[PDB]
Short mmCIF file of all heavy atoms in Angstrom, two decimals:
data_model
loop_
_atom_site.label_atom_id
_atom_site.label_comp_id
_atom_site.label_asym_id
_atom_site.label_seq_id
_atom_site.Cartn_x
_atom_site.Cartn_y
_atom_site.Cartn_z
N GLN A 14 45.34 -33.34 -77.23
CA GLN A 14 46.68 -32.70 -76.98
C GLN A 14 46.62 -31.35 -76.29
O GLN A 14 47.55 -30.86 -75.71
CB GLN A 14 47.36 -32.51 -78.33
CG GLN A 14 47.68 -33.73 -79.10
CD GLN A 14 48.22 -33.40 -80.43
OE1 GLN A 14 47.60 -32.77 -81.20
NE2 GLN A 14 49.43 -33.92 -80.72
N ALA A 60 30.18 -4.91 -52.61
CA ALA A 60 29.82 -4.75 -51.23
C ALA A 60 29.33 -6.12 -50.60
O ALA A 60 29.74 -6.44 -49.49
CB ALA A 60 28.73 -3.71 -51.02
N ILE A 83 26.68 7.57 -51.21
CA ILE A 83 26.98 8.63 -52.11
C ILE A 83 27.24 8.01 -53.52
O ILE A 83 28.36 7.51 -53.72
CB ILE A 83 28.20 9.42 -51.70
CG1 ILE A 83 28.29 9.59 -50.18
CG2 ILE A 83 28.19 10.78 -52.34
CD1 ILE A 83 29.62 10.03 -49.63
N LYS A 118 50.20 -3.44 -57.19
CA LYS A 118 50.31 -4.88 -57.42
C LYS A 118 48.95 -5.52 -57.57
O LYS A 118 48.79 -6.49 -58.32
CB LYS A 118 51.10 -5.57 -56.34
CG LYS A 118 52.53 -5.04 -56.15
CD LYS A 118 53.25 -5.68 -54.92
CE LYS A 118 54.51 -4.83 -54.52
NZ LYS A 118 55.52 -5.67 -53.91
N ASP A 143 37.10 -12.56 -59.18
CA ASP A 143 36.38 -13.79 -59.44
C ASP A 143 37.40 -14.89 -59.07
O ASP A 143 38.19 -15.29 -59.92
CB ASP A 143 35.84 -13.83 -60.86
CG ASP A 143 35.27 -15.14 -61.22
OD1 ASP A 143 34.99 -15.91 -60.30
OD2 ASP A 143 35.17 -15.43 -62.48
N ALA A 220 31.53 -22.96 -79.50
CA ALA A 220 32.97 -23.37 -79.23
C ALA A 220 33.06 -24.85 -78.91
O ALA A 220 34.07 -25.51 -79.37
CB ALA A 220 33.49 -22.59 -78.09
N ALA A 224 35.38 -27.65 -81.15
CA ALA A 224 36.34 -28.52 -80.51
C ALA A 224 36.31 -29.96 -81.07
O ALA A 224 35.23 -30.38 -81.57
CB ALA A 224 36.19 -28.51 -79.05
N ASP A 252 37.83 -33.28 -63.46
CA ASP A 252 37.23 -34.40 -64.21
C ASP A 252 37.65 -34.45 -65.64
O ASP A 252 37.55 -35.51 -66.29
CB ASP A 252 35.68 -34.29 -64.21
CG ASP A 252 35.08 -34.56 -62.82
OD1 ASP A 252 35.67 -35.26 -62.00
OD2 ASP A 252 33.98 -34.02 -62.60
#
Side-chain angles (χ1 to χ4, degrees):
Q14 297 174 304
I83 323 164
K118 299 172 198 213
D143 170 19
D252 292 334

